[PDB]
Structures are given as C-alpha cells and as structure tokens.
Amino acid sequence: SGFRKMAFPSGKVEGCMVQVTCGTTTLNGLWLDDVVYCPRHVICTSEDMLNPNYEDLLIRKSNHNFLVQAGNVQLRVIGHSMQNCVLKLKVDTANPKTPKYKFVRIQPGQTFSVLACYNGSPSGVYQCAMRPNFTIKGSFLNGSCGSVGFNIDYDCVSFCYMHHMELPTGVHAGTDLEGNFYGPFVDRQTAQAAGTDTTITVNVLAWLYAAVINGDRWFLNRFTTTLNDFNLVAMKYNYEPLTQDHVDILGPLSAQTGIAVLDMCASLKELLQNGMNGRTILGSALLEDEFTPFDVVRQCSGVT
Amino acid sequence: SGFRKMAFPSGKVEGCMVQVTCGTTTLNGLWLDDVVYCPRHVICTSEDMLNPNYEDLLIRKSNHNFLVQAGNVQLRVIGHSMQNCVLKLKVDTANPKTPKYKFVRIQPGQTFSVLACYNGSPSGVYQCAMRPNFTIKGSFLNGSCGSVGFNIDYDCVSFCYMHHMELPTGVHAGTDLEGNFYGPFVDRQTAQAAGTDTTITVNVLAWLYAAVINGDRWFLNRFTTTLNDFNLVAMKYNYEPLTQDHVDILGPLSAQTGIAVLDMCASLKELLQNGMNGRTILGSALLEDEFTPFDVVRQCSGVT
C-alpha cells in the first residue's frame, strides 16, 4: 500500500550522460553507441540565442571544437551533424554502458522520468508529464540542457525528451531525440508564451483508482454520468475531454476496483464542483494528473 | 527554475540489490562488500509473523538455506548472523559494484530516496522523509521488504533505511542498516499504532523559501512573529516546534532571498490560519514538508 510519485530507476541513463562543451558553453549530452546527442544551442553565445542562424553558426565549428568528456576521460569526436534541433556528435568509442534503447515521441498526458544533470553528472531524478500545451514543469537550472526524459520497459530505455529551453514563465520546452520540439517552441530566446495548461483527465481518473486501491475512498459518491455530461463539466474546469479511448484504457482499473469508469467520472465531477473541503486524496489537496493509467497499474502491481 | 520532489540518482544503489529467499519467502537484500543485509523476517512463515522468536527460528536455518541471487547468478553464502532486526549474510564474493558507503541513522524530518525493489530488481525511485512519528509514507507491496533508503554526498551513499513492515494503517516502518527500527515498531504482525504525524515545520519553511526563489511569492505578507508566538500557532496546527537550531539551518535561504526567517514564519502562520483560499504554492495545495533546507539549497544550486 501507499502511492508515490515514482520515477524509473535511473542507472541505465546515468551510464549514458556526458559533458559537452563548445567554446564557452557547457551542457549535457546523451552517449548511445558511438553517437553523443545534445542541444544544438551548445554552439551559441548568449547574444546568438536572440536570433540564431544555426546552419551559419555551425559552419564555424569543427569536430575538435566539441569537447565531450565521459567521467574524467575525453572522447574523440570524428563527425558532427545537425538533425533538427539536436547535434549528433559521432565519437570513436561506443558507449560500453549503452542500454537497449529506442527513441520515441510521446503524446501530451504521457509521463516520463527526467535525470537532471549538470556538467554531464546526474543531480537527481523526478517524474513529470508532457503537458497538454507541450511544456513540461521540470526543475532545470543553467547547465541542465541536454538532460533527458525516458521510460523503461524492463531492460529497454525509451528516450522521449531532451531539455532545451526555459520559457519566460518558468515552464520548460524540449525535443524528442530526433531533435523535433514538442509543441510550437523554438530554440531561440524570444517571446514564446504557452497555451492553456489543462488537466489530464484520464490521469486524474487513474489516480482516483489508485486512491481507492490504497484505501482513500471518501470521494466515492452515489452518482454516475455520461461522457457527454462529464465533458461539459470538464470543459468548464479546463480539463481535457475524456474519450471512449480513455474509458477503454481505464478498463483494467475499473475491473480491479469494481467501480465503473463513468461512476468514477461522476465522483470527479463532484470533486470539481464541490472542491476538496480541506480533505486530501493520497496526501494531495489537488487532483493529481501526472500518473497515467499504465503508471497506476505498474505501481499497484510491482513491475520491475 | 521549477522545483520538483527529486530523488537521488539510483544507479549506485541498483548495483547493490539482490534477491534473498529463505524457504518460501523472497525479499530484497543489499549487497555491500561481501555481506548481504536483509530483514530477519525472511526466515518467517505467515504464521511465524504473529509471534516470532527470531533466535529460535534462526537455529533451524543454515547458510545453504539462504538463497542469494544477483541478477541471474547465485552467490555462495559462507556465514550468517543476526544484528538486531537484520540478517547479515556473508558471501564468498565482494560486490564489484560496491559504492563508497556509510550507514547512518537519520533523525525525524530528514529526507531520503527509496529504491523500491521486487525480487532483487529495482521498480522505481521516490523521495520521502522520516516522519516525526518514525513512520515513512512509502509505496511498498508484498515482496518490497529489504528495499533501502539512502542519501548521496557526491560519490558516497549513506544508507539510512531498510524496509520491513507495513502497519495496519498503511504507513511503513523499518530499520537503519544496523537493524534498529526507527521508532517503537517491531517486526511482528501485531497492533502497532502510529503516533501523531505532525508537520515538519523547518521543511515547510525551506519549501516556502524555494517557492520565493522560483517566483511563487503571493503568500509573503507584511508581518513578522517570534519563535514563541509562532510555536503557539504551530502547536495548534500539529506542526513541530521550531527551534533556534532550525532558524540557524535556514540562514542561507534567508540570506539568498532577503526574507528573515521569522518573517517567513509569519507568512506560514497566516497560511495556517487563513488557508490557501484555492491557491497553490509550487503546484501544491498543501504545505509540503518533505524537502529539508539542505534539499532546497541543493536543488536550487544544482549539486551533482
């Protein structure tokens, strides 16, 4: 029993972190096989960030201008290329600790673990979600760029995020490992406002199921609703619309607890309208939305 | 910017996890040098847990009755001894991945990371605190016993907790790595009720400083208080008394933000009396107390 915001064990990713320096800028890189991936803004000065022409700035850089250090040992860079907003630095040595891996592009609402790093060294691990506005609410200071987000399926690490930017509002933006930004964000120091950060409804319902499984049941009510009625309330509260696909995904939690998905929707509808009244659910005074239905099943079953 | 509940990178601890089986019970063990540490209740049947005589039950066990498996390879047990509530299984092979380590006994209010494991395999990592009633609010299912809590200081892992029990109320109890339980708990399936789970005041203040550093400043008020006046309110709200030692520990955060510790106490006093009014601080609707002042400085500075 008990339910925690839990990150994946970070060891497999720690073995991939390296430091990348270009000129006066140092950030993190991800070393997989003989390639080091890092944000292309490693080539920029503070001034360059205002309106960078990456293709032009990159012409002035050679392989020897990218300093890659793994622990206290220097890697030899034998090639470099830009793919979208990431640089791929080909090195002469395959990372001996390369785990089984995939590069995946996640959808909003999906959760992942971040291994926050500085100077190629891991500082901490935390769990977050791709927000519906394509930002993430992370914990990143200057030097954390190139830190990555990932999920693990037994022994395969699916990398889904690489940190690039902090928006003027303190929220974060980054790319998948092919260098494509999530959402409309760009690697330029300019006005980039985020859209509405709506609540991930299917994750809230999954978390209410985790609460019932772990004994917190006070919010269960005598009501039911329909998808259309629920969605009218969800729209009003800036919650994402719930679809039949989401109801299907919640099926195993509904089966385990015996609480129909639409009945849990009705409980959530009353929590939205009435509030918590100073009460808590799984130690929280707000409805948590950074646990997917898969995370709830995984934690409640004990998948290693 | 941004502030997350962050655990230490778990890799150094993942390299120490092993599976320990005795008869029909399988749990986790911690392999450091040539010793495997695990809860002594690995020797108990479900019936034994009701009123176990560990010294008597242990007489019926020999070295060959303890099966230790590291990955898919079996370790040879050449000695076994009980130290308080843990067994120390001497093996013929030193763990090649043994990090620099210490065994420490933490005080209530101190935080640590847990690497939750099943069958010697890591499932996730999360952050928690030793509650003032000596319980921890973890996420542990059957098979998680022997999972450990730790802190890291650069390259040295200080192990502070080993999981042993889930109380009838769903909260958790365990020992330090010398096998001494935190608090009054025992490794027996009997009535063990926890005391008052008070809020760790100095951690709440540290977290309010993290909020100011990260832009959430709405709760800062025009008031101050004294330790004695603050403590009268803290007692009423089931918060731990704040001491001059706590004020001293908050000194660096006070210096960084320019907000005197007693002024932050006055802001906290108004939050306790007035509530949040539907507002949030660092994405939370309740006052978070599982960040120590050291955790706040570490995260806000980027220690690796």
Ligand SMILES: CC(=O)N1CCN(CC(=O)Nc2cnccc2C2CC2)CC1
């Ligand atoms: C060379 C340069 O001025 N750069 C290179 C691009 N970066 C982009 C950027 O947003 N990085 C960043 C990401 N997360 C947290 C914090 C920061 C930094 C304090 C801003 C800004 C700094």
Ligand SMILES: CC(=O)N1CCN(CC(=O)Nc2cnccc2C2CC2)CC1
């Ligand atoms: C042999 C036996 O019956 N044991 C051995 C001692 N254990 C003690 C115990 O509290 N373990 C435990 C810890 N955390 C979460 C969950 C559990 C278990 C479901 C109870 C109980 C089970």
